[model samples]
Target chain A: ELTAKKRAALNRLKTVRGHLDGIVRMLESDAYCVDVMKQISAVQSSLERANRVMLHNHLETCFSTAVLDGHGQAAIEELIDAVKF
Target chain B: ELTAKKRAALNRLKTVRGHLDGIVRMLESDAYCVDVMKQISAVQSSLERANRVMLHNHLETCFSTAVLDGHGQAAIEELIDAVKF
Candidate 1:
């Protein structure tokens, strides 16, 4: 894991973890459905962003260089398969 | 706009735009399908991250504050509506 990128992603993930956990508490406390969904949505959105940051760093630092070197197409296909989620 | 959040979001967006614009050029040059999809996914991922960062900042700095102050549920609902995309 690239430390800087991983650090950023992990920080977001931790915050989202708090949001997710708080969501459970909110549900247990009989919070409004809208609020529950909103918090859930917040977690969803945070993870998606985390995904992007990881991949963005890959593209900028790793993928672009490999592509320019004329030997990255194979790596590209592998990434496509891996990131289907 | 909150300068720090806006700045972060805009930087990511500009990078994604470069990726997107480069994807078009790659397509024009007959790049592989997997490569194209990978680039598209990168853009999608970046936008999602940007969205999350914006919303996360709002939640941490704005929504949490308001909620603590007793006037944030409405804002939560409003955010839910705005983020449906």
Candidate 2:
């Protein structure tokens, strides 16, 4: 039922692509170490944000519905804790 | 029935943290673009491995269980396609 989910992912991917491009430029241009680190953190944080957003949406559509339909099986969510960083 | 799952997750988290610390050093050292990019690739591969391992583990213990339990809700897997990348 969610129409904007793909768009949301597209936007996040676009941002990540841009972030990577910047890091690429930094590498090519020999930018400051601190600046590169800052950018790295930015990318990491962006990923984390996107991860949570996607999970939240998944919970809304996929998980809650299953739970409501009397098929509540809560196991994969724990696997979420095993995510990157 | 899976006991080492949590321990595996902890090991992955520790590696990610170490990778972060290494990235910080790269930032401090103003590492080259190629070098940084290679390290970035390392991180990416590390993360992808962690994600897959965790997902596979979850599939075996969680998602697969549901599917086998006569609750083959496939929507959960579809939502997984939405990543920050």
Candidate 3:
């Protein structure tokens, strides 16, 4: 059950995982504090971008499918419920 | 003018911003690579979590609404197009 979407997302996550570990090594070695932070920032941006991809995919597929099937109201409620965070 | 969802996601990003800067300080002062990496990991997780929140909101609202309006097929195609990474 691996959609291309899921595969790509996993790949993106894996890249970030590598970057995370690399950043740890940087911090472990020395004051490359600024360099380490740069890597961290890159990771943050990568994750955020990944999130956007996931969000868009779900919207185009799951959400729209539900609404077209006449479950739009329920989908709206479900989303609102989760929005509270 | 933000929804509760957007507001919450923004708040999460703001927190990460603070952590990112703090991590830079840790690196500058030297001697605690483990601690710095821990913070970076935290920030990465936070960003990913924030992305989940956003995805859910879109599924609930935008996608559902579009389908209900007879745009389901278009939405589906749009999503698939973007899924290519």
Which candidate gets the maximum TM-score versus the true structure?
1
Please report, in order, the local distance difference test score of every candidate based on alpha carbons: 0.58, 0.48, 0.54
Docking class of 3: incorrect
List each candidate's DockQ score: 0.03, 0.02, 0.04
TM-score of chain B of each: 0.76, 0.70, 0.77
Among incorrect, acceptable, medium and high, the docking class of model 1 is: incorrect
- Assess candidate 1 and give its TM-score to the true structure: 0.47
Q: What is the DockQ of the complex in model 1?
A: 0.03
On lDDT, the leading prediction is 1
Ranking by DockQ: 3, 1, 2
- When sorted by lDDT, best at the front, the candidate numbers are 1, 3, 2
B1-85: candidate 1 lDDT, tens digit per residue: 2346546655665565466456556544544435554555555666667667667666766577675555667776676674773
Interface RMSD for each predicted structure: 14.8, 18.2, 16.6
Clashes of 3: 0
